[PDB]
Scaffold this active site. Structure first.
Site, PDB file in Angstrom:
ATOM      1  N   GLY A  53     -21.698  18.313  11.910  1.00  0.00           N
ATOM      2  CA  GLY A  53     -22.372  19.025  10.920  1.00  0.00           C
ATOM      3  C   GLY A  53     -22.140  18.828   9.574  1.00  0.00           C
ATOM      4  N   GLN A  54     -21.005  18.114   9.168  1.00  0.00           N
ATOM      5  CA  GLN A  54     -20.893  18.065   7.825  1.00  0.00           C
ATOM      6  C   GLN A  54     -21.724  17.135   7.252  1.00  0.00           C
ATOM      7  N   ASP A  55     -22.053  16.999   5.884  1.00  0.00           N
ATOM      8  CA  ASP A  55     -22.953  16.582   5.255  1.00  0.00           C
ATOM      9  C   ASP A  55     -23.336  14.903   5.656  1.00  0.00           C
TER      10      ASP A  55
END
Lengths: 159, 91, 135
Positions: A53-55
């Site tokens: 889920g990190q950018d």
């Protein structure tokens, strides 16, 4: 059954997956990538794609959209600052043509934490009531205990 | 596939199939049609999806191959970003 | 770049597999390879022959030409040497040259081309080195 599990970083997606696969609570690292695993529940074999889920990774989920029968969207119920951001990600995800008929299951997670928002609160903030085009469900979960996880797999299997 | 410019519908099918050989062959067939100079963006999401993180070199090498000869043009499965689907999990 | 493309040709009138290091010679690759390698690169059984202002280095294998093309040059020994190393690498992938088997191992050959010649500068390769990549 093919499942895509996403959500913002630190929501608990990998914890959920390996609790389900190993009955164990593992020590996660941020997932730069995906984990993909197969889980057996009641005669269904769910292939779960847990996508970080990190950018940088968030920008890549669209490659996992196609062929998805159901979507698990994990939310950290204790993080109120990022709930709007979750809402924004999920709303345009709902607009994706490859995700058009996929079953939508929200996990309001870390329900174990004292100030966790309730599932009802989360339902209002994510705008879940406004989905009329496909199946949705919200489920309070705790991935560490395992609470709500199989209730999720149950709901999903009834697509 | 020496040079066959309409075959992109079959390649999408062949690109993910649950059989690694088929996926490699598909991606290979895309490469040979582009090099000659023929149709390729339809496939992109399929192409990108299996291979991305893995240390399994052959598919990775194949995808790595396709990023030096057309990366810019193809955008279904990549779009435009700083950490594109050319390099995000290729870190 | 000094080396436009490194190319395997069939003199069927087309570039069977070929490598464009950076986007320049896409379609261009096929027309050059298709016309010139048919005439033996316009050669006379000489490894260097230059036609339409492009240096073609070659080796015939069957109805096929393994071709190196440059239009600039840094040294004499070097152009042959990348072609030569390529010629150790190509039968490992395709058991000599032959259009159908060359076609099937587009990925293999193409990957070797990127590895062998990088941004037109002739790096070196070897059959064991090639393995790590296609593993």
């Amino acid at each position: 059954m093919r499942i895509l599990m996403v959500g913002l970083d630190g929501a608990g997606k990998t914890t959920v997956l390996y609790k389900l696969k190993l009955g164990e609570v593992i020590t996660t690292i941020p997932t730069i990538g995906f984990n993909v695993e197969t889980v057996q529940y009641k005669n269904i074999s769910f292939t779960v794609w847990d996508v970080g889920g990190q950018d940088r990774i968030r920008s890549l989920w669209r490659h996992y959209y196609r062929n998805t029968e159901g979507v698990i969207f994990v939310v950290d119920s204790n993080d109120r600052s990022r709930i709007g951001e979750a809402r924004e990600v999920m709303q345009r995800m709902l607009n994706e043509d490859e995700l058009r008929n996929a079953a939508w299951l929200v996990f309001a997670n870390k329900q174990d934490l004292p100030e966790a928002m309730s599932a009802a609160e989360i339902t209002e903030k994510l705008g879940l009531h406004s989905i009329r085009n496909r199946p949705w469900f919200i489920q309070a979960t705790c991935a560490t205990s395992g609470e709500g996880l199989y209730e999720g797999l149950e709901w999903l299997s009834n697509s | 596939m020496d040079s066959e410019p309409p075959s992109e519908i079959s390649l999408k099918n062949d690109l993910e199939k649950g059989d690694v050989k088929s996926k490699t062959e598909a991606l290979k067939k895309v490469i040979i049609m582009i090099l000659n100079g023929e149709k390729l963006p339809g496939l992109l999401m399929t192409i990108i999806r299996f291979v991305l993180p893995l240390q399994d070199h052959t598919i990775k090498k194949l995808l790595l191959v396709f990023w030096e000869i057309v990366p810019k043009t193809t955008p279904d499965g990549r779009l435009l970003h700083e950490m594109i689907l050319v390099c995000d999990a290729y870190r | 770049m000094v080396l436009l493309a490194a190319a395997v040709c069939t003199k069927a009138g087309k570039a069977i597999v070929s490598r464009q290091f950076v986007e320049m010679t896409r379609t261009r690759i096929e027309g050059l390879l298709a016309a010139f390698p048919k005439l033996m690169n316009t050669g006379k059984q000489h490894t260097f022959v230059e036609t339409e202002s492009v240096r073609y280095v070659y080796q015939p294998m069957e109805k096929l030409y393994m071709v190196l093309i440059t239009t600039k040059n840094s040294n004499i020994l070097e152009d042959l040497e990348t072609l030569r190393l390529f010629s150790r690498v190509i039968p490992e992938y395709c058991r000599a040259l032959e259009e159908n088997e060359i076609s099937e191992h587009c990925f293999d050959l193409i990957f070797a081309f990127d590895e062998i010649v990088a941004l037109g500068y002739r790096e070196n390769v070897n059959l064991a080195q090639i393995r790590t990549f296609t593993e």
